[PDB]
Design an enzyme around this catalytic site. Structure first.
Site, PDB file in Angstrom:
ATOM      1  N   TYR B 508       0.733  -1.120   0.164  1.00 35.84           N
ATOM      2  CA  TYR B 508      -0.087  -0.139  -0.040  1.00 35.84           C
ATOM      3  C   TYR B 508       0.851   1.202  -0.038  1.00 35.84           C
ATOM      4  CZ  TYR B 508      -3.488   3.284   2.253  1.00 35.84           C
ATOM      5  OH  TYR B 508      -4.351   4.036   2.602  1.00 35.84           O
ATOM      6  N   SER B 591      -4.593   0.899  -5.666  1.00 32.33           N
ATOM      7  CA  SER B 591      -4.613   2.373  -5.417  1.00 32.33           C
ATOM      8  C   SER B 591      -3.358   3.060  -5.411  1.00 32.33           C
ATOM      9  CB  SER B 591      -5.401   2.694  -3.806  1.00 32.33           C
ATOM     10  OG  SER B 591      -6.542   2.131  -3.824  1.00 32.33           O
ATOM     11  N   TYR B 592      -2.796   3.471  -4.234  1.00 37.78           N
ATOM     12  CA  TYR B 592      -1.491   3.790  -3.723  1.00 37.78           C
ATOM     13  C   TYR B 592      -0.401   2.687  -4.036  1.00 37.78           C
ATOM     14  CZ  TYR B 592       1.584   7.230  -2.001  1.00 37.78           C
ATOM     15  OH  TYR B 592       2.791   8.273  -1.871  1.00 37.78           O
ATOM     16  N   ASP B 669     -14.454   3.159 -12.677  1.00 36.20           N
ATOM     17  CA  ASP B 669     -13.888   3.581 -11.421  1.00 36.20           C
ATOM     18  C   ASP B 669     -13.790   5.192 -11.186  1.00 36.20           C
ATOM     19  OD1 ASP B 669     -10.779   2.197  -9.886  1.00 36.20           O
ATOM     20  OD2 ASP B 669     -11.884   3.752  -9.354  1.00 36.20           O
ATOM     21  N   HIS B 701     -13.734   0.813  -8.096  1.00 30.49           N
ATOM     22  CA  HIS B 701     -12.670   0.942  -7.442  1.00 30.49           C
ATOM     23  C   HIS B 701     -12.212  -0.433  -6.680  1.00 30.49           C
ATOM     24  CE1 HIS B 701      -8.535   2.516  -6.577  1.00 30.49           C
ATOM     25  NE2 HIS B 701      -8.837   2.276  -5.271  1.00 30.49           N
TER      26      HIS B 701
HETATM   27  C1  LIG Z   1      -8.143   7.805   3.504  1.00 28.98           C
HETATM   28  C2  LIG Z   1      -9.712   7.720   3.543  1.00 28.98           C
HETATM   29  C3  LIG Z   1     -10.201   9.239   3.664  1.00 28.98           C
HETATM   30  C4  LIG Z   1     -10.243   7.254   2.031  1.00 28.98           C
HETATM   31  N1  LIG Z   1      -9.369   6.209   1.370  1.00 28.98           N
HETATM   32  C5  LIG Z   1      -8.462   6.673   0.416  1.00 28.98           C
HETATM   33  C6  LIG Z   1      -8.391   7.975   0.033  1.00 28.98           C
HETATM   34  N2  LIG Z   1      -9.354   8.008  -1.417  1.00 28.98           N
HETATM   35  C7  LIG Z   1      -7.409   5.538  -0.146  1.00 28.98           C
HETATM   36  C8  LIG Z   1      -6.831   6.007  -1.292  1.00 28.98           C
HETATM   37  C9  LIG Z   1      -5.526   6.425  -1.148  1.00 28.98           C
HETATM   38  C10 LIG Z   1      -4.638   6.648  -2.331  1.00 28.98           C
HETATM   39  C11 LIG Z   1      -5.143   6.572  -3.752  1.00 28.98           C
HETATM   40  C12 LIG Z   1      -6.532   6.165  -3.746  1.00 28.98           C
HETATM   41  C13 LIG Z   1      -7.416   5.874  -2.629  1.00 28.98           C
HETATM   42  C14 LIG Z   1      -7.750   4.283   0.256  1.00 28.98           C
HETATM   43  C15 LIG Z   1      -6.665   3.206  -0.161  1.00 28.98           C
HETATM   44  C16 LIG Z   1      -6.902   2.182   0.412  1.00 28.98           C
HETATM   45  O1  LIG Z   1      -5.838   1.014  -0.042  1.00 28.98           O
HETATM   46  C17 LIG Z   1      -5.563  -0.049   0.817  1.00 28.98           C
HETATM   47  C18 LIG Z   1      -4.345  -0.803   0.110  1.00 28.98           C
HETATM   48  N3  LIG Z   1      -3.784  -0.380  -1.073  1.00 28.98           N
HETATM   49  O2  LIG Z   1      -4.064  -2.064   0.478  1.00 28.98           O
HETATM   50  C19 LIG Z   1      -7.634   1.669   1.216  1.00 28.98           C
HETATM   51  C20 LIG Z   1      -8.405   2.536   2.051  1.00 28.98           C
HETATM   52  C21 LIG Z   1      -8.446   3.870   1.417  1.00 28.98           C
HETATM   53  C22 LIG Z   1      -9.306   5.168   2.075  1.00 28.98           C
HETATM   54  O3  LIG Z   1     -10.092   4.691   2.993  1.00 28.98           O
END
Ligand SMILES: CC(C)Cn1c(CN)c(-c2ccccc2)c2cc(OCC(N)=O)ccc2c1=O
Ligand SMILES: CC(C)Cn1c(CN)c(-c2ccccc2)c2cc(OCC(N)=O)ccc2c1=O
Ligand SMILES: CC(=O)N[C@@H]1[C@@H](O)[C@H](O)[C@@H](CO)O[C@H]1O
Ligand SMILES: *[C@@H]1O[C@H](CO)[C@@H](O)[C@H](O)[C@H]1NC(C)=O
Ligand SMILES: *[C@@H]1O[C@H](CO)[C@@H](O)[C@H](O)[C@H]1NC(C)=O
Ligand SMILES: *[C@@H]1O[C@H](CO)[C@@H](O)[C@H](O)[C@H]1NC(C)=O
Ligand SMILES: *[C@@H]1O[C@H](CO)[C@@H](O)[C@H](O)[C@H]1NC(C)=O
Ligand SMILES: *[C@@H]1O[C@H](CO)[C@@H](O)[C@H](O)[C@H]1NC(C)=O
Ligand SMILES: *[C@@H]1O[C@H](CO)[C@@H](O)[C@H](O)[C@H]1NC(C)=O
Ligand SMILES: *[C@@H]1O[C@H](CO)[C@@H](O)[C@H](O)[C@H]1NC(C)=O
Ligand SMILES: *[C@@H]1O[C@H](CO)[C@@H](O)[C@H](O)[C@H]1NC(C)=O
Ligand SMILES: *[C@@H]1O[C@H](CO)[C@@H](O)[C@H](O)[C@H]1NC(C)=O
Ligand SMILES: *[C@@H]1O[C@H](CO)[C@@H](O)[C@H](O)[C@H]1NC(C)=O
Lengths: 733, 727
Positions: B508, B591-592, B669, B701
């Site tokens: 992540y 995501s990230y 997405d 997503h």
């Molecule tokens: C922080 C909150 C306000 C909202 N939020 C966001 C923000 N959009 C992201 C995220 C971060 C960067 C890019 C897109 C989404 C996110 C990414 C996750 O990925 C988990 C993994 N990669 O294992 C899990 C949860 C979250 C999440 O809850």
């Protein structure tokens, strides 16, 4: 110690990097005895009779001018030259461009009244140097290049009203052209079509553009899918000699006949017959009825008049009319008479001789073979291309038939170079005194210049002997062109066979498919392509087969698929694979199938057919459901998708519905995201259907690529990708 | 023997029991005996069947969720559930009189309701429909219309727009009742000038022309939504005259430029606290506003503004923390970074600028869970200095030094990761422990602190996992530049130190992320360990959370740098551990995670053979303003454009020649737009890099559709198994 045996092969990099270049001879006849040519960016005028070339325009003459010249066009009096730059492609034929005009006789760019930027189409009168051009969907005319443009139309509106240019569907499916302008022979009249798309729904897709664009763009194109609201079409003739600076020009509408106006129809052919006579062909949306009108200019009236006695009906009892559309007429000098390819009583397309006033024609050719096109008409002779020679449907030769005596037919190309050359196309001089022949196979392309005066050879223009020279120690593949008899009917196939081919061996086999209506994938043409690589380098046989629905063999074959896409033509490719492995040299465990477009469709239907014959396959830009493809193409073969026409088979002939059967095979699915023709939608739905039945498969999208996935970089990637998929499917290392 | 198979994961063979409850009062809670709902007594554990299964047989429709009014007299039935974004949806709603046992058919709640909510006490009802706020004083009576300015995609009254939902309030709703339901506080969002993202929706096979979905969505540096805040008095609504909504305007310090509303918390019956954040999210302000009888208005004394700012990064973990007000409302508690960058509970006096920190150390408070007259309850990762453990703690307010660990010792072997749910007045509490052992839910009284009973022990799940060869989890740290960084490995069963295993780095790596914890999980990683004998590892390098600002802010203004370098260094350190076959190391993430996997694969390090990126960010100008700019500032020459330019995966396309890549992305997405993947794929195409791809038609997503979720994991497993030469 290699002893100069061929141990090279034609590799993927050779295909992709264009190592073995196929020279062409591209010329343009300007007169009846002279043509133009690009030696080294220079333009040479050539005397065909003698050989002597005068330099027409030096390469350096422009581009002090400051832009990359994309193309040119010389006024037919040889006094001006249109320079095409800022070329920006749109669909298959359409594009925008800037244009300037150089004065040959007095050596200078025209600096006043320049054609505006973003011109959608531009064209000279056939005589002199009158100019006609569309811009923001309106037609303008310039009698002299440096004078102001007269505005012919005022109603043009982006994506709704098209004056002098086609819309998406007319471009791709009716006129294979962006231009909906037609000058009369002496430039007196400018015929034009006008399309109205107001109610035609829009296909919408994302365009991502350069990574600099922060928010993607949504392209929106008026695109009628099967059964949707089609565009409507009006037709006009304006008189370019009675334009004025103080009064808008008068366009004279010529309305479509009673029989067309009663429902949805199309304008499918325009053809001037004389300075004052034009012929229209109109087609009903149900494309089995078409009417040719023949309209005379009434001198005192100033109007156009198509007499109902000169209406000519062409209709089909067993399918649609024309190969992809009604054949164009070729008029006699007086225009009292014309020749036209139509299906004869036996289903074979042949040259019929029509009188302006009689219903009945006379077929001047006949036989279980077909005329492909009429190329030239003089007072004494008619020049046409047919596949008559040796009853080979996938061969082409130039023939001249004696107007006065139909029994006196002479093959002009057949015996020139029989083993090198069995696929000809021709380019006649302005009045047919000379012609260029373009042989395309089975040997290396051969270009040659001819006097029609006594059908003798003048010179070899290009013999491709650089390429011949390069291929000596390359282990090239061979082509086999033959047939099989199913239901007492010849069906032709071709095999690109690997070098040192061995009937004892069991080769893996790729079935390359198009298989759409009037398709021919089995011919005498020579090709350096992906199939060449696979055979030469990878020892795969690439075969193709023309089964029911295929072209140039008569209506009993071609129409066999009518109202029934995704049936026989699909079934026949599966049987083609069986017949091949029954020939003894095909590995049953390694049979792949692939295709682009309709071919993608057929591939996909094949893989989902549950036959067990195929291990894997690649569909590129496939059609998945005929309600997704355009009306004029689809309805031609499928009718309307309605409970009272043919919805049942529209519904029955979707690849989606066969998703379950893909568990039996390995599938690569490829599609460009900017595909305006076969919309990405179609593949998106295949993928969804496969996902929903739990079948794993391979996929690749191409960002911003259209139907041809033709970007240099994108072109190299997909074929590389496909080669891997095929290599790993066939266990090639 | 049998291993834990991909099917087991995909078809949830081995389920984890949740004892989910909802407190109804201070000594009662509801629980859903699948085909039933019971009110349980926390005291005695006895129950009484609150609502019979087939009462709403008659209804005809499927009941997605229920909701009891505080005073118990009515129950709100939610149906016709239509998911929208992450928290947003619409639904239909009927109300049921319990004192009567009949379903209300009079002045009903309309279809396509965007949000509903009882007032905290009594039975008042406020809902949002076509972006306007409606209140019902009684369920069977006409509703009063509060706002008339609502317009689809443009003006959002009492509900959040796309970016506030996702990144600010993690909620669709923007309504906040006062404690006794007198006031409805709400926010109003304007997207009038926010650009729209557009993408195709293909929909069912029968839709001839694709629909184009358009959503107002501010990408980095784009025009943002604007916000206004209002309080309406729900005890004085008129049927004749329009409701009158008072406005609380943002502080002068926020009105000077683009800003955000990021917290609404009621302090007392007549006191509301608002937190506002500047668009450059390192300066937030708290207003404390009091209702004025004589004036009818609210007043936020500048002398009660509490600034929270950061010199080293942004403010808050993802936003400033929420305050917790003592009952009289003259003081509040709040998690803020201390002077050494660690986050701890600071005790504030409403009138006074300097707070007193009441917790201290090299660990962090995760959250304040409950505040009573004499104790503050919080969760922290203090225990045994493990950042990825979670324990409950009581802190005696009369003596901050007397701190007790309520959960540490309950079951230290099985349980190191706790969350809590207190009763309405904190008399009781439910502990959920989520690892490292099987989850264990317990009920406790907070008076004597005894452990009333086990609620769910997952003994069922225990009995099946004996039969299956399960993997184990190793949770530990490596030292870099004299600093601890934590990692977990999912080790295959019968793990042999002397053998060389393939390893998959699960990433992540986003800011304040934590992938190295004591949580127990049955996931894809479990399958890869158990069935394919791959080691799945994760690692919390720089920018990772719950370990202080020094670590978290390390990547401030510099996304796509240290957090990327650190996944590589981890892979390096792991391959020096002697049981990692380093001809077979892979990296993947969503995501990230996808961005970092992609950035790592394009680094040219040489460590990784192959990778998978699922819905990756490809460059930050494509992601939303709020998240992105918090870490990256603005993408302009006068701010941070250069680094935005340098941080793209596209710029590294050439380096993908060295790796096998799989790029997956759902075509619908809304969050990380397919764009982001389309531009990567194009970059690769242009430099002649071959790679694997997959789109998922109409998946967002989550790629969370039953079939789609199965399809993606299967595709991913084949790719990884081919990469590792596993048959
Ligand atoms: C922080 C909150 C306000 C909202 N939020 C966001 C923000 N959009 C992201 C995220 C971060 C960067 C890019 C897109 C989404 C996110 C990414 C996750 O990925 C988990 C993994 N990669 O294992 C899990 C949860 C979250 C999440 O809850
Ligand atoms: C007939 C013309 C007026 C236009 N036209 C059309 C119709 N739009 C199609 C086609 C057929 C079905 C589906 C989509 C396109 C087509 C397909 C080709 O496939 C090559 C192959 N598969 O080997 C080559 C040329 C053509 C073409 O020229
Ligand atoms: C983009 C937009 O809607 N701008 C409007 C503006 O034209 C108007 O004067 C003002 C008052 O309502 O509201 C805002
Ligand atoms: C081409 O050749 C002929 C041969 O007699 C010669 O007269 C002429 O000058 C050349 N053509 C032109 C137009 O210069
Ligand atoms: C075409 O565009 C360029 C620059 O946008 C301009 O300088 C030139 O004059 C234009 N040509 C015409 C014919 O308007
Ligand atoms: C196009 O068609 C619409 C009806 O579909 C009609 O109202 C309109 O006038 C037409 N426009 C032109 C310029 O023919
Ligand atoms: C030509 O037609 C347009 C609109 O139909 C009008 O604005 C213009 O004035 C007309 N020109 C003349 C010369 O009548
Ligand atoms: C055209 O086809 C339709 C539908 O297949 C059929 O009913 C009719 O025979 C045909 N029309 C004409 C004029 O031949
Ligand atoms: C809500 O929708 C359902 C079904 O379409 C209907 O029974 C009900 O009357 C609708 N409207 C209202 C105001 O409840
Ligand atoms: C929303 O902001 C726009 C300015 O972009 C303005 O037109 C409109 O008045 C505002 N709407 C509301 C409800 O305040
Ligand atoms: C309330 O306001 C609206 C919109 O401003 C308007 O229709 C009317 O003046 C009022 N309606 C009621 C019911 O008070
Ligand atoms: C709720 O608070 C409001 C505002 O202070 C007050 O008017 C009302 O009396 C309160 N309710 C109770 C039960 O005291
Ligand atoms: C907030 O961030 C900006 C931009 O990074 C910076 O210039 C400024 O000093 C910071 N403000 C504070 C109070 O630290």
């Amino acid at each position: 110690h290699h002893h100069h045996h061929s141990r090279k092969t034609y590799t993927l990099t050779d295909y992709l990097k264009n190592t073995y270049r196929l020279k062409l001879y591209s010329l343009r006849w300007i007169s009846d005895h002279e043509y133009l040519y690009k030696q080294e960016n220079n333009i040479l005028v050539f005397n065909a009779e003698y050989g002597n070339s005068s330099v027409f325009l030096e390469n350096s003459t422009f581009d002090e001018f400051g832009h990359s010249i994309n193309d040119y066009s010389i006024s037919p009096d040889g006094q001006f030259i249109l320079l095409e730059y800022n070329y920006v492609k749109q669909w298959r034929h359409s594009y925008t461009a800037s244009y300037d005009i150089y004065d040959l006789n007095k050596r200078q760019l025209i600096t006043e009244e320049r054609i505006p930027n973003n011109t959608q189409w531009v064209t000279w009168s056939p005589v002199g140097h009158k100019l006609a051009y569309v811009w923001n969907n309106d037609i303008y005319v310039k009698i002299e290049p440096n004078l102001p443009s007269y505005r012919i139309t005022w109603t043009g509106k982006e994506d709704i009203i098209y004056n002098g240019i086609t819309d998406w569907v007319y471009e791709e499916e009716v006129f294979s052209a962006y231009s909906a302008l037609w000058w009369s022979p002496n430039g007196t009249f400018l015929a034009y079509a006008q399309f109205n798309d107001t109610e035609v729904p829009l296909i919408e897709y994302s365009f991502y553009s350069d990574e600099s664009l922060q928010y993607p763009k949504t392209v929106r194109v008026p695109y009628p899918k099967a059964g949707a609201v089609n565009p409507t079409v009006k037709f006009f003739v304006v008189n370019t000699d009675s334009l004025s600076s103080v009064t808008n020009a008068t366009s004279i509408q010529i309305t479509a006949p009673a029989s067309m106006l009663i429902g949805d129809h199309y304008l499918c052919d325009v053809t001037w017959a004389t300075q004052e006579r034009i012929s229209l062909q109109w087609l009903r949306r149900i494309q089995n009825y078409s009417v040719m009108d023949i309209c005379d200019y009434d001198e005192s009236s100033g109007r156009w008049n198509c007499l109902v006695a000169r209406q000519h009906i062409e209709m089909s009892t067993t399918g649609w009319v024309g190969r992809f559309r009604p054949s164009e007429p070729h008029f006699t000098l007086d225009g009292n008479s014309f020749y036209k390819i139509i299906s004869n009583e036996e289903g074979y397309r042949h040259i019929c001789y029509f009188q302006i006033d009689k219903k009945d024609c006379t077929f001047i050719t006949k036989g279980t073979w077909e005329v492909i096109g009429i190329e030239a008409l003089t007072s004494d002779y008619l020049y046409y291309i047919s596949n008559e020679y040796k009853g080979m449907p996938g061969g082409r030769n130039l023939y001249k038939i004696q107007l006065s005596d139909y029994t006196k037919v002479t093959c002009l190309s057949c015996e020139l170079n029989p083993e090198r050359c069995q696929y000809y196309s021709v380019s006649f001089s302005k009045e047919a005194k000379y012609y260029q022949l373009r042989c395309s196979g089975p040997g290396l392309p051969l270009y040659t210049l001819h006097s029609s005066v006594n059908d003798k050879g003048l010179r070899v223009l290009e013999d491709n002997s650089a390429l011949d020279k390069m291929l000596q120690n390359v282990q090239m593949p061979s082509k086999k062109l033959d047939f099989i008899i199913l239901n007492e009917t010849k069906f032709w196939y071709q095999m690109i066979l690997p070098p040192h081919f061995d009937k004892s061996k069991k080769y893996p086999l790729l079935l390359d498919v198009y298989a759409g209506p009037c398709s021919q994938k089995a011919d005498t043409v020579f090709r350096l392509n992906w199939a060449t690589y696979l055979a030469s380098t990878e020892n795969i046989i690439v075969a193709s087969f023309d089964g029911r629905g295929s072209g140039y063999q008569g209506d009993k074959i071609m129409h066999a698929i009518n109202r029934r896409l995704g049936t026989f033509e699909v079934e026949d490719q599966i049987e083609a694979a069986r017949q091949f492995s029954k020939m003894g040299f095909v590995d049953n465990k390694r049979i792949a199938i692939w295709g682009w477009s309709y071919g993608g469709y057929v591939t996909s239907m094949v893989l989902g057919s549950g036959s067990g014959v195929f291990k894997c396959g690649i569909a590129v830009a496939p059609v998945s459901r005929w309600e997704y493809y355009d009306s004029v193409y689809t309805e031609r073969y499928m009718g309307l998708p309605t409970p009272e026409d043919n919805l049942d088979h529209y519904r029955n002939s979707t690849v989606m519905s066969r998703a379950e059967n893909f568990k039996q095979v390995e599938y690569l699915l490829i599609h460009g995201t900017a595909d305006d023709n076969v919309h990405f939608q179609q593949s998106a739905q295949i993928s969804k259907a496969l996902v929903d039945v739990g079948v794993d498969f391979q996929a690749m999208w191409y960002t911003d690529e259209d139907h041809g996935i033709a970007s240099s970089t994108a072109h190299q990637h997909i074929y590389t990708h496909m080669s891997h998929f095929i290599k790993q499917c066939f266990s090639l290392p």
